[PDB]
Amino acid sequence: KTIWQNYIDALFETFPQLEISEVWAKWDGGNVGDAKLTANIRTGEHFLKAREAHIVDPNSDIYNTILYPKTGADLPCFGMNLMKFSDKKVIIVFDFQHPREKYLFSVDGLPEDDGKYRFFEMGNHFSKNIFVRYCKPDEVDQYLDTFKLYLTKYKEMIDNNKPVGEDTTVYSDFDTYMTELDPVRGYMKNKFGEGRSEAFVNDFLFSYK
Numbered sequence: 198k199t200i201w202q203n204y205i206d207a208l209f210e211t212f213p214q215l216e217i218s219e220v221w222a223k224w225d226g227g228n229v230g231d232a233k234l235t236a237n238i239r240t241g242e243h244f245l246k247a248r249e250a251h252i253v254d255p256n257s258d259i260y261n262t263i264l265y266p267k268t269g270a271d272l273p274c275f276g277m278n279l280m281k282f283s284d285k286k287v288i289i290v291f292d293f294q295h296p297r298e299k300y301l302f303s304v305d306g307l308p309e310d311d312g313k314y315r316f317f318e319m320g321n322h323f324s325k326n327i328f329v330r331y332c333k334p335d336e337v338d339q340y341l342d343t344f345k346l347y348l349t350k351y352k353e354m355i356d357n358n359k360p361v362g363e364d365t366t367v368y369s370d371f372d373t374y375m376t377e378l379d380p381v382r383g384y385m386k387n388k389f390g391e392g393r394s395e396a397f398v399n400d401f402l403f404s405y406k
């Protein structure tokens with residue numbers, strides 16, 4: 198079981214076409230294992246891919262998923278990182294992540310946040326509407342309706358533009374940026390080893406570099 202289940206359900210209710218097209222990894226690790234990784238690639242109409250990583254151990258529950266739309270409509274990706282770190286500490290992040298470097302994207306009517314957060318440069322693959330909240334595991338679903346508004350706006354963008362391009366190099370700047378700045382490598386090395394951490398980051402999470 199996972200505390201992120203209602204986010205995950207909402208995601209695939211909005212985009213029921215996103216079917217698993219490859220289980221990229223199911224790995225065991227952590228203490229003898231207590232940490233499990235599931236890494237799925239999904240495909241479906243209007244998307245290049247959605248890649249979904251879910252890492253669960255006794256204290257942590259991390260759901261990191263990015264939807265990469267087909268190209269040709271200048272659409273942002275939709276990214277979420279739902280991170281339970283301990284039984285006291287959760288960070289919820291989701292946003293429209295635009296592939297063009299240093300382009301400030303926004304959707305009018307959505308919550309706005311111009312604060313600066315760790316690791317990342319705001320305005321550069323994160324939008325005016327980046328949604329970041331810190332709360333306790335049992336509070337996570339209080340932002341679910343907002344997550345669902347983001348999904349609703351995203352689905353309108355997809356359905357109104359109907360992108361059909363498949364130029365994965367549109368996402369190369371984005372994947373490069375997400376690679377240098379995301380704090381993953383360290384956590385996965387410790388839990389799973391070096392080769393697995395490297396491949397997870399470079400060949401699964403951000404593979405369009």
Ligand SMILES: C=CC1=C(C)/C(=C/c2[nH]c(/C=C3N=C(/C=C4\NC(=O)C(C)=C4C=C)C(C)=C\3CCC(=O)O)c(CCC(=O)O)c2C)NC1=O
Pocket residue numbers: 250252259261262263275276277278280288290291292294313314315316317329375379380381384385
């Ligand atoms: C898979 C394993 C995995 C690990 C181990 C991980 C760790 C991780 N991500 C973080 C932050 C963050 N991560 C993001 C955002 C994202 N990052 C993304 O990969 C995507 C897709 C988004 C958003 C759509 C942001 C904005 C922060 C900073 C949060 C903050 O400022 O505290 C932090 C810092 C938390 C803190 O400030 O205390 C850690 C430790 N992220 C992972 O994905």
